[PDB]
Design a protein around this ligand. Sequence first.
Ligand SMILES: CC[C@@H]1C[C@]2(C)C=C(C)[C@H](C)C[C@]23NC(=O)C(=C3O)C(=O)[C@]2(C)[C@@H](CC[C@H]3[C@H]2CCC[C@@H]3O)C[C@H]1O
Ligand SMILES: CC[C@@H]1C[C@]2(C)C=C(C)[C@H](C)C[C@]23NC(=O)C(=C3O)C(=O)[C@]2(C)[C@@H](CC[C@H]3[C@H]2CCC[C@@H]3O)C[C@H]1O
Lengths: 181, 181
Amino acid sequence: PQIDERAMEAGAAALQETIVDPGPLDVTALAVAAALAAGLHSAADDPAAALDKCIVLDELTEFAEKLVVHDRPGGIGTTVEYVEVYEDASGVRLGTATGNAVVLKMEPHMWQFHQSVSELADGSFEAVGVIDCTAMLRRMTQVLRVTGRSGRYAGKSGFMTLAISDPNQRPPHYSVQVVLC
Amino acid sequence: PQIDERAMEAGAAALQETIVDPGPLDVTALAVAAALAAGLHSAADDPAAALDKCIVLDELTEFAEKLVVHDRPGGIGTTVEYVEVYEDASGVRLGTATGNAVVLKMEPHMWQFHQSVSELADGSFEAVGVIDCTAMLRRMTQVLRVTGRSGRYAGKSGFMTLAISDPNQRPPHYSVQVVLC
Ligand SMILES: CC[C@@H]1C[C@]2(C)C=C(C)[C@H](C)C[C@]23NC(=O)C(=C3O)C(=O)[C@]2(C)[C@@H](CC[C@H]3[C@H]2CCC[C@@H]3O)C[C@H]1O
Ligand SMILES: CC[C@@H]1C[C@]2(C)C=C(C)[C@H](C)C[C@]23NC(=O)C(=C3O)C(=O)[C@]2(C)[C@@H](CC[C@H]3[C@H]2CCC[C@@H]3O)C[C@H]1O
Protein backbone atom coordinates (compact mmCIF):
# COMPACT_ATOMS: atom_id res chain seq x y z
CA PRO A 1 0.00 0.00 0.00
CA GLN A 2 0.91 3.66 -0.51
CA ILE A 3 1.52 6.62 1.78
CA ASP A 4 1.07 10.12 0.39
CA GLU A 5 4.28 12.21 0.38
CA ARG A 6 2.70 14.76 2.68
CA ALA A 7 2.39 12.04 5.33
CA MET A 8 5.79 10.53 4.55
CA GLU A 9 7.42 13.95 4.94
CA ALA A 10 5.29 15.34 7.81
CA GLY A 11 8.20 14.86 10.18
CA ALA A 12 10.39 16.92 7.89
CA ALA A 13 7.70 19.59 7.74
CA ALA A 14 7.73 19.75 11.52
CA LEU A 15 11.52 20.19 11.48
CA GLN A 16 11.19 23.31 9.32
CA GLU A 17 8.84 25.01 11.80
CA THR A 18 10.20 28.02 13.68
CA ILE A 19 7.66 27.47 16.46
CA VAL A 20 8.69 24.34 18.34
CA ASP A 21 6.29 24.28 21.24
CA PRO A 22 5.58 20.98 22.97
CA GLY A 23 2.84 20.66 25.54
CA PRO A 24 2.31 17.05 26.41
CA LEU A 25 -0.36 15.63 28.66
CA ASP A 26 0.62 12.59 30.83
CA VAL A 27 -1.67 9.58 31.36
CA THR A 28 -2.48 10.40 34.94
CA ALA A 29 -3.74 13.79 33.82
CA LEU A 30 -5.66 12.15 30.99
CA ALA A 31 -7.21 9.68 33.45
CA VAL A 32 -8.39 12.56 35.68
CA ALA A 33 -10.03 14.09 32.61
CA ALA A 34 -11.63 10.78 31.60
CA ALA A 35 -12.93 10.03 35.11
CA LEU A 36 -14.21 13.57 35.61
CA ALA A 37 -16.04 13.44 32.27
CA ALA A 38 -17.49 10.03 33.15
CA GLY A 39 -18.73 11.40 36.47
CA LEU A 40 -16.63 8.77 38.28
CA HIS A 41 -14.21 11.23 39.84
CA SER A 42 -14.27 14.26 42.09
CA ALA A 43 -11.59 16.94 42.12
CA ALA A 44 -11.06 16.28 45.78
CA ASP A 45 -10.05 12.73 44.83
CA ASP A 46 -6.34 12.02 44.13
CA PRO A 47 -4.96 11.60 40.59
CA ALA A 48 -3.53 8.13 41.11
CA ALA A 49 -7.09 7.10 42.04
CA ALA A 50 -8.42 8.23 38.70
CA LEU A 51 -5.67 6.25 36.98
CA ASP A 52 -6.71 3.10 38.88
CA LYS A 53 -10.33 3.35 37.68
CA CYS A 54 -9.22 3.58 34.03
CA ILE A 55 -8.18 1.30 31.23
CA VAL A 56 -4.83 2.72 30.19
CA LEU A 57 -2.98 2.39 26.90
CA ASP A 58 0.25 4.30 27.08
CA GLU A 59 3.83 4.29 25.78
CA LEU A 60 2.28 3.56 22.42
CA THR A 61 3.60 4.64 19.09
CA GLU A 62 1.66 4.92 15.84
CA PHE A 63 2.49 5.69 12.26
CA ALA A 64 0.81 5.42 8.88
CA GLU A 65 0.86 2.13 6.96
CA LYS A 66 -1.55 3.37 4.33
CA LEU A 67 -2.64 6.95 3.73
CA VAL A 68 -4.45 8.18 0.64
CA VAL A 69 -5.43 11.81 0.08
CA HIS A 70 -8.31 12.82 -2.20
CA ASP A 71 -7.58 16.48 -2.94
CA ARG A 72 -10.23 19.12 -3.52
CA PRO A 73 -9.57 22.63 -4.77
CA GLY A 74 -8.36 25.02 -2.16
CA GLY A 75 -8.02 22.09 0.11
CA ILE A 76 -11.42 22.58 1.72
CA GLY A 77 -13.11 19.18 1.99
CA THR A 78 -10.06 17.22 0.94
CA THR A 79 -10.41 13.72 2.34
CA VAL A 80 -7.93 11.30 3.85
CA GLU A 81 -8.29 7.51 4.32
CA TYR A 82 -5.72 5.83 6.52
CA VAL A 83 -4.62 2.72 8.32
CA GLU A 84 -2.10 3.26 11.06
CA VAL A 85 -0.31 0.69 13.15
CA TYR A 86 0.16 0.74 16.88
CA GLU A 87 3.52 -0.39 18.27
CA ASP A 88 4.86 -0.69 21.79
CA ALA A 89 8.18 0.83 22.84
CA SER A 90 10.04 -2.30 21.65
CA GLY A 91 8.54 -2.13 18.16
CA VAL A 92 6.01 -4.93 18.62
CA ARG A 93 2.83 -4.46 16.58
CA LEU A 94 -0.29 -4.22 18.76
CA GLY A 95 -2.98 -3.47 16.25
CA THR A 96 -4.25 -0.90 13.82
CA ALA A 97 -6.57 2.03 13.52
CA THR A 98 -8.61 2.53 10.41
CA GLY A 99 -9.93 5.99 9.82
CA ASN A 100 -10.75 8.89 7.63
CA ALA A 101 -10.31 12.66 7.94
CA VAL A 102 -11.85 15.69 6.31
CA VAL A 103 -10.02 18.99 5.90
CA LEU A 104 -12.20 21.71 7.44
CA LYS A 105 -9.85 24.63 6.92
CA MET A 106 -6.35 25.32 5.57
CA GLU A 107 -5.35 28.78 6.72
CA PRO A 108 -3.96 30.12 8.97
CA HIS A 109 -4.04 26.63 10.57
CA MET A 110 -5.11 23.48 8.87
CA TRP A 111 -7.89 21.75 10.82
CA GLN A 112 -9.17 18.20 10.20
CA PHE A 113 -12.14 16.23 11.48
CA HIS A 114 -10.90 12.69 12.32
CA GLN A 115 -12.80 9.53 12.94
CA SER A 116 -11.37 6.07 13.37
CA VAL A 117 -11.83 2.61 14.78
CA SER A 118 -8.90 0.99 16.59
CA GLU A 119 -8.56 -2.81 16.75
CA LEU A 120 -6.25 -4.36 19.32
CA ALA A 121 -5.96 -7.97 20.61
CA ASP A 122 -8.39 -7.35 23.47
CA GLY A 123 -11.04 -5.21 21.76
CA SER A 124 -11.84 -2.11 19.78
CA PHE A 125 -12.63 1.55 20.29
CA GLU A 126 -13.64 4.55 18.25
CA ALA A 127 -11.85 7.91 18.25
CA VAL A 128 -13.38 11.20 17.03
CA GLY A 129 -11.99 14.70 17.01
CA VAL A 130 -11.43 18.13 15.57
CA ILE A 131 -7.69 18.65 15.48
CA ASP A 132 -5.35 21.51 14.60
CA CYS A 133 -2.77 19.96 12.28
CA THR A 134 -0.65 23.11 12.28
CA ALA A 135 -0.46 22.99 16.08
CA MET A 136 0.70 19.33 15.80
CA LEU A 137 3.40 20.34 13.32
CA ARG A 138 4.51 22.88 15.94
CA ARG A 139 4.75 19.95 18.42
CA MET A 140 1.55 20.39 20.38
CA THR A 141 -0.64 17.62 21.60
CA GLN A 142 -4.20 17.19 20.37
CA VAL A 143 -7.00 15.36 22.21
CA LEU A 144 -9.68 13.13 20.66
CA ARG A 145 -12.84 11.62 22.19
CA VAL A 146 -12.71 7.87 22.70
CA THR A 147 -15.70 5.53 22.92
CA GLY A 148 -15.13 1.86 23.65
CA ARG A 149 -16.92 -0.62 21.37
CA SER A 150 -15.94 -4.29 21.73
CA GLY A 151 -14.08 -6.48 24.16
CA ARG A 152 -12.44 -4.95 27.20
CA TYR A 153 -13.39 -1.41 26.03
CA ALA A 154 -17.14 -1.95 25.67
CA GLY A 155 -19.32 0.57 27.48
CA LYS A 156 -16.31 2.70 28.47
CA SER A 157 -15.29 6.15 27.21
CA GLY A 158 -12.54 8.68 27.61
CA PHE A 159 -9.84 10.49 25.69
CA MET A 160 -6.88 9.99 23.44
CA THR A 161 -3.77 12.18 23.03
CA LEU A 162 -1.77 12.49 19.82
CA ALA A 163 1.59 14.29 19.28
CA ILE A 164 4.53 13.96 16.91
CA SER A 165 7.19 11.94 18.72
CA ASP A 166 9.98 11.32 16.18
CA PRO A 167 10.05 13.74 13.27
CA ASN A 168 13.17 12.14 11.71
CA GLN A 169 11.22 9.02 10.79
CA ARG A 170 9.44 8.64 7.46
CA PRO A 171 6.55 8.43 7.95
CA PRO A 172 6.87 10.15 11.28
CA HIS A 173 5.87 8.41 14.49
CA TYR A 174 3.32 9.85 16.89
CA SER A 175 3.01 9.29 20.60
CA VAL A 176 -0.48 8.00 21.46
CA GLN A 177 -2.20 7.56 24.82
CA VAL A 178 -5.68 6.26 25.48
CA VAL A 179 -7.60 6.24 28.76
CA LEU A 180 -11.18 4.98 29.19
CA CYS A 181 -13.56 4.41 32.06
CA PRO B 1 -19.34 38.23 42.17
CA GLN B 2 -15.62 38.84 42.29
CA ILE B 3 -13.09 37.71 39.70
CA ASP B 4 -9.72 36.34 40.62
CA GLU B 5 -6.96 38.72 39.62
CA ARG B 6 -5.36 36.08 37.39
CA ALA B 7 -8.57 36.09 35.32
CA MET B 8 -8.70 39.89 35.29
CA GLU B 9 -5.10 40.09 34.05
CA ALA B 10 -5.08 37.15 31.63
CA GLY B 11 -5.30 39.48 28.61
CA ALA B 12 -2.15 41.25 29.77
CA ALA B 13 -0.62 37.81 30.21
CA ALA B 14 -1.49 36.95 26.58
CA LEU B 15 0.08 40.20 25.36
CA GLN B 16 3.37 39.12 26.96
CA GLU B 17 3.52 36.01 24.75
CA THR B 18 6.08 36.02 21.95
CA ILE B 19 4.23 33.32 20.01
CA VAL B 20 1.10 34.90 18.56
CA ASP B 21 -0.40 32.21 16.43
CA PRO B 22 -4.17 32.40 15.73
CA GLY B 23 -5.86 29.55 13.91
CA PRO B 24 -9.64 29.95 13.93
CA LEU B 25 -12.39 27.95 12.32
CA ASP B 26 -15.27 29.44 10.34
CA VAL B 27 -18.77 28.21 11.31
CA THR B 28 -19.20 26.41 8.06
CA ALA B 29 -16.16 24.29 8.93
CA LEU B 30 -17.51 23.80 12.41
CA ALA B 31 -20.89 22.80 10.95
CA VAL B 32 -19.19 20.26 8.72
CA ALA B 33 -17.50 18.77 11.77
CA ALA B 34 -20.76 18.76 13.80
CA ALA B 35 -22.73 17.15 10.99
CA LEU B 36 -20.07 14.50 10.32
CA ALA B 37 -19.89 13.69 14.02
CA ALA B 38 -23.67 13.33 14.21
CA GLY B 39 -23.94 11.14 11.12
CA LEU B 40 -26.10 13.73 9.33
CA HIS B 41 -23.53 14.66 6.66
CA SER B 42 -21.28 13.16 4.01
CA ALA B 43 -17.69 14.24 3.25
CA ALA B 44 -18.78 14.25 -0.38
CA ASP B 45 -21.53 16.84 -0.02
CA ASP B 46 -20.79 20.51 -0.02
CA PRO B 47 -20.06 22.50 3.06
CA ALA B 48 -22.92 24.92 2.84
CA ALA B 49 -25.19 21.89 3.05
CA ALA B 50 -23.82 21.11 6.48
CA LEU B 51 -24.43 24.66 7.65
CA ASP B 52 -28.19 24.41 6.88
CA LYS B 53 -28.47 21.20 8.91
CA CYS B 54 -27.17 22.92 12.03
CA ILE B 55 -28.20 25.22 14.79
CA VAL B 56 -25.54 27.97 14.55
CA LEU B 57 -24.30 30.47 17.11
CA ASP B 58 -21.54 32.53 15.48
CA GLU B 59 -19.71 35.68 16.50
CA LEU B 60 -20.41 35.37 20.19
CA THR B 61 -18.31 37.19 22.76
CA GLU B 62 -17.95 35.95 26.32
CA PHE B 63 -16.22 37.17 29.46
CA ALA B 64 -16.22 36.32 33.15
CA GLU B 65 -18.59 37.98 35.59
CA LYS B 66 -17.45 35.70 38.43
CA LEU B 67 -14.35 33.55 38.73
CA VAL B 68 -13.12 31.80 41.89
CA VAL B 69 -9.92 29.78 42.07
CA HIS B 70 -9.22 27.11 44.70
CA ASP B 71 -5.50 26.70 44.51
CA ARG B 72 -3.76 23.47 45.19
CA PRO B 73 -0.07 23.21 46.02
CA GLY B 74 1.89 22.51 42.82
CA GLY B 75 -0.92 23.95 40.64
CA ILE B 76 -2.10 20.49 39.61
CA GLY B 77 -5.71 19.86 40.82
CA THR B 78 -6.39 23.55 41.31
CA THR B 79 -10.13 24.09 40.66
CA VAL B 80 -11.90 26.97 39.00
CA GLU B 81 -15.55 27.99 39.31
CA TYR B 82 -16.86 30.58 36.88
CA VAL B 83 -19.86 32.41 35.55
CA GLU B 84 -19.57 34.10 32.21
CA VAL B 85 -21.78 36.28 30.07
CA TYR B 86 -22.56 35.82 26.39
CA GLU B 87 -23.04 38.83 24.08
CA ASP B 88 -23.58 39.07 20.34
CA ALA B 89 -21.28 41.20 18.13
CA SER B 90 -23.26 44.35 18.87
CA GLY B 91 -23.18 43.76 22.64
CA VAL B 92 -26.68 42.41 23.34
CA ARG B 93 -26.67 39.81 26.21
CA LEU B 94 -27.71 36.33 25.03
CA GLY B 95 -27.29 34.37 28.21
CA THR B 96 -24.71 33.01 30.64
CA ALA B 97 -22.70 29.90 31.28
CA THR B 98 -21.56 28.55 34.62
CA GLY B 99 -18.62 26.21 34.58
CA ASN B 100 -16.05 24.28 36.53
CA ALA B 101 -12.47 23.45 35.58
CA VAL B 102 -9.63 21.40 37.03
CA VAL B 103 -5.96 22.00 36.28
CA LEU B 104 -4.56 18.77 34.85
CA LYS B 105 -1.00 19.86 34.18
CA MET B 106 1.08 23.03 34.58
CA GLU B 107 4.23 22.74 32.44
CA PRO B 108 5.36 23.09 29.77
CA HIS B 109 1.72 23.85 28.83
CA MET B 110 -1.10 24.30 31.31
CA TRP B 111 -4.04 22.03 30.58
CA GLN B 112 -7.52 22.18 32.08
CA PHE B 113 -10.54 19.98 32.01
CA HIS B 114 -13.67 22.16 31.53
CA GLN B 115 -17.33 21.47 31.89
CA SER B 116 -20.02 24.11 31.61
CA VAL B 117 -23.72 24.66 31.07
CA SER B 118 -24.90 27.53 28.92
CA GLU B 119 -28.34 29.06 29.43
CA LEU B 120 -29.70 31.09 26.50
CA ALA B 121 -33.16 32.32 25.48
CA ASP B 122 -33.97 29.20 23.45
CA GLY B 123 -32.50 26.61 25.80
CA SER B 124 -29.41 25.11 27.36
CA PHE B 125 -26.45 22.97 26.37
CA GLU B 126 -23.39 21.49 28.02
CA ALA B 127 -19.77 21.83 26.86
CA VAL B 128 -16.95 19.47 27.87
CA GLY B 129 -13.29 19.63 26.88
CA VAL B 130 -9.63 19.18 27.61
CA ILE B 131 -8.01 22.43 26.68
CA ASP B 132 -4.49 23.74 26.36
CA CYS B 133 -4.48 27.06 28.24
CA THR B 134 -0.98 27.89 27.10
CA ALA B 135 -2.04 27.46 23.46
CA MET B 136 -4.99 29.75 24.21
CA LEU B 137 -2.73 32.53 25.55
CA ARG B 138 -0.77 32.14 22.30
CA ARG B 139 -4.00 32.94 20.41
CA MET B 140 -4.95 29.43 19.34
CA THR B 141 -8.52 28.17 19.18
CA GLN B 142 -9.62 25.29 21.39
CA VAL B 143 -12.56 23.00 20.74
CA LEU B 144 -15.06 21.56 23.17
CA ARG B 145 -17.75 18.93 22.72
CA VAL B 146 -21.28 20.24 22.97
CA THR B 147 -24.42 18.32 23.98
CA GLY B 148 -27.81 20.02 23.89
CA ARG B 149 -29.87 19.78 27.10
CA SER B 150 -33.12 21.69 26.59
CA GLY B 151 -35.33 23.52 24.10
CA ARG B 152 -34.14 23.83 20.54
CA TYR B 153 -30.78 22.28 21.47
CA ALA B 154 -32.27 19.06 22.90
CA GLY B 155 -31.20 15.83 21.19
CA LYS B 156 -28.52 17.71 19.29
CA SER B 157 -24.74 17.63 19.59
CA GLY B 158 -21.71 19.34 18.10
CA PHE B 159 -18.80 21.58 18.91
CA MET B 160 -17.82 24.84 20.48
CA THR B 161 -14.75 26.99 19.68
CA LEU B 162 -13.05 29.22 22.18
CA ALA B 163 -10.28 31.78 21.54
CA ILE B 164 -9.14 35.01 23.05
CA SER B 165 -10.56 37.98 21.11
CA ASP B 166 -9.71 41.17 23.05
CA PRO B 167 -6.82 40.83 25.47
CA ASN B 168 -7.04 44.58 26.20
CA GLN B 169 -10.10 44.08 28.39
CA ARG B 170 -10.10 43.30 32.10
CA PRO B 171 -11.17 40.52 32.22
CA PRO B 172 -10.30 39.66 28.62
CA HIS B 173 -12.95 38.92 26.01
CA TYR B 174 -13.22 35.61 24.15
CA SER B 175 -14.78 34.67 20.82
CA VAL B 176 -17.17 31.69 20.88
CA GLN B 177 -18.97 29.68 18.23
CA VAL B 178 -21.37 26.87 18.88
CA VAL B 179 -22.76 24.56 16.23
CA LEU B 180 -25.12 21.64 16.94
CA CYS B 181 -27.17 19.14 14.99
C1 LIG C 1 -0.45 17.09 12.14
C2 LIG C 1 -1.67 16.33 11.68
C3 LIG C 1 -1.48 15.07 10.83
C4 LIG C 1 -1.19 13.83 11.73
C5 LIG C 1 -2.14 12.60 11.64
C6 LIG C 1 -3.47 12.98 12.30
C7 LIG C 1 -1.49 11.54 12.49
C8 LIG C 1 -1.63 10.23 12.24
C9 LIG C 1 -0.90 9.29 13.15
C10 LIG C 1 -2.46 9.70 11.09
C11 LIG C 1 -1.65 8.74 10.20
C12 LIG C 1 -3.06 10.83 10.25
C13 LIG C 1 -2.25 12.13 10.23
N1 LIG C 1 -1.03 11.76 9.60
C14 LIG C 1 -0.97 12.40 8.42
O1 LIG C 1 0.10 12.33 7.72
C15 LIG C 1 -2.21 13.16 8.07
C16 LIG C 1 -2.98 12.84 9.24
O2 LIG C 1 -4.32 13.41 9.40
C17 LIG C 1 -2.66 14.08 7.00
O3 LIG C 1 -3.85 14.33 6.95
C18 LIG C 1 -1.66 14.85 6.16
C19 LIG C 1 -0.93 13.92 5.21
C20 LIG C 1 -0.61 15.53 7.08
C21 LIG C 1 0.07 16.72 6.44
C22 LIG C 1 -0.34 17.30 5.31
C23 LIG C 1 -1.51 16.79 4.50
C24 LIG C 1 -2.43 15.89 5.34
C25 LIG C 1 -3.39 15.34 4.31
C26 LIG C 1 -4.28 16.45 3.78
C27 LIG C 1 -3.48 17.51 3.06
C28 LIG C 1 -2.30 17.96 3.91
O4 LIG C 1 -1.46 18.78 3.10
C29 LIG C 1 -1.13 16.04 8.44
C30 LIG C 1 -0.49 15.30 9.64
O5 LIG C 1 0.72 15.97 9.97
C1 LIG D 1 -8.05 28.55 28.66
C2 LIG D 1 -7.44 29.81 29.25
C3 LIG D 1 -8.29 30.43 30.37
C4 LIG D 1 -9.55 31.10 29.77
C5 LIG D 1 -10.94 30.65 30.30
C6 LIG D 1 -11.13 29.18 29.91
C7 LIG D 1 -11.90 31.48 29.49
C8 LIG D 1 -13.10 31.85 29.92
C9 LIG D 1 -13.90 32.73 28.99
C10 LIG D 1 -13.64 31.41 31.26
C11 LIG D 1 -14.17 32.61 32.02
C12 LIG D 1 -12.59 30.67 32.10
C13 LIG D 1 -11.13 30.97 31.73
N1 LIG D 1 -10.90 32.30 32.11
C14 LIG D 1 -9.92 32.36 33.03
O1 LIG D 1 -9.43 33.46 33.48
C15 LIG D 1 -9.55 31.00 33.52
C16 LIG D 1 -10.41 30.21 32.68
O2 LIG D 1 -10.34 28.76 32.76
C17 LIG D 1 -8.55 30.39 34.41
O3 LIG D 1 -8.65 29.18 34.55
C18 LIG D 1 -7.34 31.14 34.89
C19 LIG D 1 -7.73 32.28 35.84
C20 LIG D 1 -6.66 31.70 33.62
C21 LIG D 1 -5.23 32.09 33.92
C22 LIG D 1 -4.55 31.69 34.98
C23 LIG D 1 -5.14 30.82 36.07
C24 LIG D 1 -6.43 30.16 35.62
C25 LIG D 1 -7.01 29.53 36.89
C26 LIG D 1 -6.07 28.42 37.38
C27 LIG D 1 -4.69 28.97 37.71
C28 LIG D 1 -4.13 29.77 36.53
O4 LIG D 1 -2.94 30.42 36.98
C29 LIG D 1 -6.64 30.80 32.36
C30 LIG D 1 -7.43 31.42 31.17
O5 LIG D 1 -6.48 32.03 30.30
